[PDB]
């Protein structure tokens, strides 16, 4: 038989209408529910909300909420990527103005689950 | 209509119920919701109350919405469109018809995107432990989706069996005129009477529905439904009352 899905504990998010949905879990394969992502996080579709589906392999998507890193303004650096959105795992090069550089001889910043690593700032 | 009064006038005890509606799921703690109608304007406020008493019962009240966030002492628009309020005597629900949102790829850009989502579903929750011991009750009301408030909702609850079932009719989109399958009444975390079951179209499962029982004598039902159609998932606002 197919294993029913228990209440989904969505990392950096959760289900809408939690109080009404929670007493009816575990749920059968094929069931789906609208879910949200917390601040600074988004769905694989690029929105703050979508639907999580109970499949034979469990909840789909497996990673419902991914970190979104917005490239900040560089006081003493080149601002072509200012305001540009980057999803978790994606990297971008930091171009600083002459006489300025990253925290420790670095040139690339990566959007991790917690945010930018390292912090994009020219001196 | 009472749209301007709902935004400007303070809370009055003599007003027709539901008098007040706490905006919790409609406005997040970090954000602000700016509502405008009939020349009036008001900003909320997670936990702030909407003066529903000034609005008309058994109808959809429409407002222009702006979802704002304070960045450098100024309010910046994240999402805009139409804010819908369906008022009943012991229950009320909010809906968001998104027209514009902040570009998913850029923080400083706004794009035209249409989305329909149910915000709050609140009122005087019926306790699961205070429900009638027996008898059958028929609830008649409205089913409302994107650009359509003409849907008809019929729901029946058997208090002896602690079960409920219903039907949606007259919505412009035929696929949304679904059957609300037989489902058990269960207590929630706060021991409020709730109902959740399957949504069926032509005897095939298309999604789920959830309802909350409202009023001291279980007079009303309010909630939502999420239905799969040929062109994607569509949400429906649900609200019905006893005759």
Author numbering:
A (entry chain A): 321 to 443
B (entry chain D): 79 to 321
Manuscript text:
Factor H binding protein (fHbp) is a 27 kDa surface lipoprotein consisting of two β-barrels that promotes resistance against complement mediated lysis and is a key meningococcal antigen that elicits SBAs. We have shown previously that fH CCP 6 and 7 (fH67) are necessary for high affinity interactions with V1 fHbp, and that these two CCPs are sufficient to inhibit binding of full length fH to fHbp. Here we characterised members of the three variant families by identifying amino acids that are critical for fH binding and through structural analysis, to inform future vaccine design and to understand the basis of the interaction of fHbp with fH. Here we show that even though V1, 2 and V3 fHbps exhibit remarkably conserved atomic structures, differences in key amino acids necessary for interactions with fH are only revealed by functional studies.
The structure of the co-complex of fHbpR106A with fH67 confirmed that there was no significant change in its overall structure. The presence of an Arg106 in V1 fHbp pushes the loop away from fH in order to accommodate the long amino acid side chain. For instance, Ala substitution of Arg106 or the corresponding residue (i.e. Pro106 in V3 fHbp) reduces, does not affect, or increases interactions of fH with V1, V2 and V3 proteins respectively; our results with V2 fHbp are consistent with others showing no effect of this residue albeit by ELISA. Previous work indicated that V1 fHbpR106S exhibits a degree of enhanced immunogenicity compared with wild-type fHbp in mice possessing extra copies of hfH as well as endogenous mfH. Immunisation of transgenic mice with the non-functional proteins, fHbpDM, fHbpI311A, and fHbpR106A elicited similar levels of anti-V1 fHbp antibodies as determined by ELISA, demonstrating that the non-functional fHbps retain their antigenicity. The non-functional proteins also elicited SBA titres (measured using human complement), that were similar as raised against the wild-type V1 fHbp. Therefore non-functional fHbps retain their immunogenicity and elicit protective immune responses.
